[PDB]
């Protein structure tokens, strides 16, 4: 539906090297467009797509400069929460951040979010009101109190309602030819021998974007969800996505079954068959 700009930070303390590795990736909808890794000396905020390259030197200088200070704050972060949880300095830990903005039909902030996790579990999060925080546990409350006292909320709110939606709009236009044109799935139904002999129908959906899609099987309308195999949607490697669904069918009644495909790149639901 609505477009969105999202940033993902992953900080990992390396008790063996003495510091932390900071990795940050950026996404417009299902497209990664920027990345940062401090693991390499002289790390920069780098482009991931053609359209983000038309940015000036100043844009990269200031993103790099920003994420650098941020990596440092996350390094201190790992050490701080380590203390909150009374954890030894012997193990490695992870501090993740997840924030962004969903642009509504109006072209305004429809949804703003910012959440943090420590060792893969909710730590602290900004509420939908962008005015208050929810702490997952006792330790998180220590931060919640510090952030309320600092009025940290109004700063996240202002970024989400301002720069985040403005950037997103600017990006959607810059990468208009890719971010705003839908790429319908290429489809086909293959037929392979299976156990007990044994015929399995497999419905492929290839090279489509965005990620969201629906693949179902139907014999006479009756859904076949229960005894069908569906795999997680996976990246193609070129920016598009893949997915298939399969079900065993009686050899001789294959055409009784139809594959139903739905995608925002198609004007209408697609009906598919072994032919």
């Amino acid at each position: 539906g609505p477009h969105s700009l999202s940033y993902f930070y992953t900080a990992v303390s390396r008790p063996d090297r003495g510091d932390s590795r900071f990795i940050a990736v950026g996404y417009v909808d299902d497209t990664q467009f920027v990345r940062f890794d401090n693991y390499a000396p002289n790390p920069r905020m780098e482009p991931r797509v053609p359209w983000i390259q038309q940015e000036g030197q100043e844009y990269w200088d200031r993103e790099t400069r920003n994420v650098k200070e941020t990596a440092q704050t996350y390094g201190v972060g790992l050490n701080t929460l380590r203390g909150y949880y009374n954890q030894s300095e012997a193990g490695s830990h992870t501090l993740q951040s997840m924030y962004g903005c969903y642009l509504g039909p109006d072209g305004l902030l429809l949804h703003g979010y910012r959440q943090d996790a420590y060792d893969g579990a909710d730590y602290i999060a900004l509420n939908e009101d962008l005015r208050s925080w929810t702490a997952a546990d006792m330790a998180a409350q220590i931060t919640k109190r510090k952030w309320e006292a600092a009025d940290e909320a109004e700063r996240r709110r202002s970024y989400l309602q301002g720069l985040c939606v403005e950037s997103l709009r600017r990006y959607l236009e810059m990468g208009k030819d890719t971010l705003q044109r839908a790429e319908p799935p290429k489809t086909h139904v293959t037929r392979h021998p299976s156990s007990d002999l044994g015929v399995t129908l497999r419905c492929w959906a290839l090279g489509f974007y965005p990620k969201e899609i629906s693949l179902t099987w139907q014999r006479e309308g009756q859904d076949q969800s229960q005894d069908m195999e569906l795999v997680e949607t996976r990246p193609s490697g070129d920016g598009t996505f893949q997915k298939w669904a399969a079900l065993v069918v009686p050899p001789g009644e294959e055409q009784s079954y139809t594959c139903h495909v739905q995608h925002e790149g198609l004007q209408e639901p697609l009906t598919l068959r072994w032919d």
Binding site: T70, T73, K146, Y159, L163, E166
Partner: peptide, 9 residues
């Protein structure tokens, strides 16, 4: 545009 550096935890 990433969000500016946050507050200390």
């Amino acid at each position: 545009n990433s969000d500016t550096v946050g507050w200390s935890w």
